């Protein structure tokens, strides 16, 4: 999750706090996840062979 979020605290009331992100340090981006090819489409073939029964 590339953002390098900072750590800011906001006071609510008696002996309590509400912790949020204050600012984004660096370059903003999005959350993403790799899945390598020749490992999922080959494995999808493994499911359909047993699903061909």
């Amino acid at each position, epitope marked *: 999750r590339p953002n390098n979020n900072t750590r800011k605290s906001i006071h609510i009331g008696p002996g309590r706090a509400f912790y949020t992100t204050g600012e984004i340090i*660096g*370059d*903003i981006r*999005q959350a*993403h996840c790799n899945i390598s090819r020749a490992k999922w489409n080959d494995t999808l073939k493994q499911i359909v062979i047993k699903l061909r029964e």
Partner: antibody
Amino acid sequence: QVHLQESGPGLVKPSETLSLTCNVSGTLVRDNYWSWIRQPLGKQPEWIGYVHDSGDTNYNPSLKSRVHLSLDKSKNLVSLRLTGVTAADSAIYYCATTKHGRRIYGVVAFKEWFTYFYMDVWGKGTSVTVSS
Amino acid sequence: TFVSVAPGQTARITCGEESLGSRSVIWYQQRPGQAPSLIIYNNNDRPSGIPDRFSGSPGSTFGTTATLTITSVEAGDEADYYCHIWDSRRPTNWVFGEGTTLIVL
């Protein structure tokens, strides 16, 4: 080598249409990006915008409604038009080349990257004075 | 600002605001009575025709400022320098940065 020469009227009355002519030699105007830079005396240069024949052209939002750019393929020259000139426009025009660069810091998809522009070859420049 | 340095020494020029996002800083050198020319792109890359004496700080350490460092400054290097800012979090600058004048003694 690419050599650029600019010509103009020099003295322009207020509220008139100012036109420039940028002679281009040694290269074709279709294969390169072109931009115009206006530099006030004693101040930093100010960028107007970059133009191309393919339509990938953007302008300064401060001067979007008053500037017009055109290309002459037959005569191999670049012209600029500006209407509603004021006394704050008394500066020096420049006709310079523009090359595009790609900055890729992140995923190549998802439209995170931003492109940049730099000036390679500059013209000699011409002096434009606006007065009544 | 104003910078004074002896000939043959190393001088540093600081231009622009503190770093907020990724930087691609463009530098120019303008002699008096002349026009600026291509000096630095991509904060450390130069086109053919100029030596390696011109160096620039990379745009990696966030919270800092872009810096121009020149080694063994000679008498002909006395010219106006202007910095251009490209940032991923700041809008595209249509005006160049404030100039810095260096003095060679």
